[PDB]
Design a protein around this ligand. Structure first.
Ligand SMILES: [Cl-]
Ligand SMILES: [Cl-]
Ligand SMILES: [Cl-]
Ligand SMILES: [Cl-]
Ligand SMILES: [Cl-]
Ligand SMILES: [Cl-]
Lengths: 225, 225, 225
C-alpha cells in the first residue's frame, strides 16, 4: 500500500511538468506549418504552445466559471513551458531538441506525461466534487477536460494557426487519450460515489500504468518499431 | 385572477420539462445526418441533445459569469432528457417515438413547451434583475437567451455535428421563436420597470397563450394541414 | 508634473467615449456589406456596433471570469453608443455623419480615441494586479485585450455578419494598434513591478502622445494626403 501512496503523491513540478511540456510542444512542432508559423508569427506560436501545455486548466476553468487564465498566475510554470517552446523552435545549435526527440528519451517523457494526465483527471473530479457534492455530470465533465486538454479545443487551436477543418472534432471522433480520459473520469467519479470498491491511490496507480503501457506502445509503434 | 396565478405557478418538472425535451430531441432527429451521427458518434449525439434541452441555461450562465454547466447539477433533469434521447434514437421496438411524433400528441407537447419557454424568459429577467437592479440591457439579454435557447448557438451546434454554415445565424436572420423571445424579454423587462401597467401573472398568461396559438398553428401548417 | 497628472485624470465620459464610439462605428460602416446589413438585419448591425464599442470590456471580463456583459449595466454609456450607431446609419438628412466623417474633424476623434485606449490598457493592468499581485501574465493579457478590443475577436465579429475568413486573425498577423497595445501592456506591467523607473502618469502621457501621433498620421496617410 505504501508504493501506491508514494507513486500517487510525487511532486509533478518541475520534472513531470517539463516532460508534459516537452511532449506537447514536440507534437505542436510536427503540425503542418508550425515551424513557418514560429518564424513569421512568433507570438501566435508561443500562444499555441501555451494552449498545448495548459489547455486542460483553461478548459476546466471555463466549465466551472473560473477565470480561463487563472492557471497563468503560476509564473514559474509558464516560464518553464516557454523555455521548452524556445529550445525546441529556436535553438538548432542546442542539443536539447535532438535529445528530447530521440525516441528512447522521448518514450520516457511520454510515460511521465501520463503520470501528470491521470493526476489532473483525479484533481478535476475532486475539485468539482468540492463545489458540487452530488453533481456527477459536473465531476465527469471536469475530469474529462482535465485529461483530454487541448484535443477538445482542437478546432480553435487550428483557427489560431489559420486552419479550419470543421468536418471533424475530438468529440465526434475521439482519439485514444480523449476516449481514455472519458473512461478515466467515470472511474474516478464512481470512486467518489463510493460505489466503486477500490481505493483512490490504487485507482491512480493502476490507471496510470494502463496509460503508460498504451501510450509508450502507441508512440513506439507509430515510429514503426 | 386566481386562474392566472395558478397557470403561472404550475410545477414544470417533470411533465412540462419532458414535453420540452421531447420536442427538442425530435427536432434534433430531423436534422441532416443526426440518425447516422447517433450510431457512429453516440456520445456526440447525446451531447448535442443536451445542448437542445439545456442550451438556454448554458447561455444564461455564460452571460452572467456562472458555470456554463451549472444546470447539470440537476441530476434527475439530465437523466430525464437522456431517457428521451435514448427512446427516440435507439428504441424502434418501443412505441415511444411513434406516439410522441404522432401529430395530435406532438401538438400537445408543443403547447407544453411554450409554457416552459415563457417561464424561462421571465425567470431570466427576474434573476438578472436580482443581480442588476436597473441593468435593463442585462435583463433583456438574459431573458432573450433563456427563450431562444440552442437557436442562438446554432452555428456551434452544427460545428459539433461536423457542419459549418457561416453564411447565416439566428441573430442575422431571426426565426419566429427567437424573434418572439426578443419581444417577450422586452415586455417582461418593462413589467420589472413598472412602466408596463400589467400584472406579472397576467403577462405570463397572455404571452403564453400567444406562443401556444402561434406554435401549434405553425407546427400543424408545417405538416401541411 | 501637474500637466501629466491633469492629462491622465480627465473624465472620458461622455466626450472622449463619444469620440471612441464615433470612430469605431465609422470603421464598422466601411466594412463590406455593413450598410445592407443595417437595413436587412438592424438588430445584428446594432449588436455588431456594441462589439466595436465595448469589445475590450467584454474580452477583459471573459479573461477574468466576470460576466461578459457586465459593462452593459452602464446604461447611459450603451445608450450613447446606440445613438452614434443610429445617427451614422439611419440619418441621411442629419448633418452628423458628414461632419464626423469629415477628415479634419475625424482626426480629432481619432486622437481622443487614443486617450481612451491608453487609459483602458492601464486600468486593465491595474485591475488584474488588484486580483493577482504578482501575476504578470494575467496583467499583460488583461491590458492587451483592453487596448486591442474588437480586433482580437474579429473572426467572430465577421461570423456575426455572415463572413468567415479563417486564413488570418489578429494574433497571427497583428495590426499596429494590436501590436502597440501589446507593447503598451508590457510597459504598464513593468511600471507595476517597479522595475521600470518611470512614473505612472508620465507613462500614460508619453504613450498616449505616441499613439496620437501614430494614429493621426496613419489615418491622414490612409486618406492619401
Ligand atoms: Cl510562482
Ligand atoms: Cl528531426
Ligand atoms: Cl436531484
Ligand atoms: Cl417517421
Ligand atoms: Cl447609469
Ligand atoms: Cl461618404
Amino acid at each position: 500500500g505504501e508504493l501506491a501512496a508514494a507513486f500517487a503523491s510525487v511532486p509533478v513540478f518541475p520534472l513531470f511538468d517539463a516532460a508534459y511540456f516537452i511532449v506537447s510542444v514536440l507534437y505542436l512542432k510536427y503540425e503542418p506549418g508550425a515551424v513557418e508559423m514560429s518564424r513569421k508569427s512568433p507570438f501566435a506560436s508561443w500562444l499555441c504552445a501555451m494552449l498545448h501545455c495548459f489547455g486542460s486548466y483553461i478548459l476546466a476553468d471555463l466549465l466551472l466559471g473560473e477565470s480561463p487564465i487563472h492557471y497563468f498566475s503560476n509564473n514559474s510554470s509558464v516560464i518553464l513551458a516557454t523555455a521548452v517552446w524556445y529550445l525546441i523552435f529556436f535553438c538548432p545549435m542546442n542539443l536539447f531538441y535532438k535529445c528530447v526527440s530521440f525516441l528512447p528519451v522521448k518514450l520516457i517523457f511520454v510515460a511521465m506525461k501520463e503520470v501528470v494526465r491521470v493526476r489532473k483527471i483525479a484533481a478535476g473530479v475532486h475539485h468539482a466534487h468540492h463545489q458540487y457534492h452530488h453533481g456527477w455530470f459536473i465531476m465527469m465533465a471536469t475530469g474529462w477536460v482535465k485529461g483530454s486538454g487541448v484535443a477538445l479545443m482542437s478546432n480553435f487551436e487550428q483557427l489560431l494557426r489559420g486552419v479550419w477543418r470543421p468536418e471533424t472534432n475530438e468529440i465526434l471522433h475521439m482519439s485514444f487519450p480523449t476516449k481514455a480520459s472519458l473512461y478515466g473520469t467515470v472511474l474516478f467519479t464512481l470512486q467518489q460515489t463510493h460505489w466503486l470498491p477500490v481505493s483512490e491511490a490504487n485507482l491512480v496507480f493502476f490507471f496510470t500504468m494502463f496509460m503508460i503501457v498504451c501510450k509508450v506502445f502507441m508512440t513506439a509503434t507509430h515510429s514503426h518499431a
